[PDB]
Amino acid sequence: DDKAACADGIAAVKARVEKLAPEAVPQKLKRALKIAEREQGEGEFDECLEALDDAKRALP
Amino acid sequence: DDKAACADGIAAVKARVEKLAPEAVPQKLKRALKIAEREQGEGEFDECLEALDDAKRALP
Ligand SMILES: [Ce+3]
Numbered sequence: 001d002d003k004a005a006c007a008d009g010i011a012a013v014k015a016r017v018e019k020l021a022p023e024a025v026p027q028k029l030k031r032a033l034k035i036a037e038r039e040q041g042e043g044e045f046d047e048c049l050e051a052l053d054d055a056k057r058a059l060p
Numbered sequence: 061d062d063k064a065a066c067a068d069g070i071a072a073v074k075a076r077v078e079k080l081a082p083e084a085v086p087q088k089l090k091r092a093l094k095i096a097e098r099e100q101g102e103g104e105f106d107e108c109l110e111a112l113d114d115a116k117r118a119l120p
Contacts, residue, residue: 042098044107
């Protein structure tokens with residue numbers, strides 16, 4: 001479900017980001033990941049999924 | 061708009077609650093108000109409006 005997709009998507013995005021130079025991770029990507037994790041912690045897994053799309057559009 | 065409705069609704073609910081004995085304010089009403097204020101602070105005014113409905117359904 002959305003809860004499962006949210007957790008998997010956070011891991012997926014972080015997997016991609018972990019292959020970037022840390023000094024080249026854009027701030028907007030970090031902000032989007034933290035929004036996704038905030039919404040995940042609030043139980044709003046649908047909003048987590050929407051923040052992950054922002055995060056994916058922030059990847060170089 | 062929703063931002064305006066959210067702020068007005070928080071004030072309205074608190075106005076009703078301020079006319080209750082503090083020891084008789086139900087915990088679920090407090091929790092709903094704090095969720096509404098959290099979502100307001102996050103800029104999710106539509107979700108604030110939905111938490112206010114929960115708050116209103118919690119009034120004695
Ligand atoms: Ce939220």
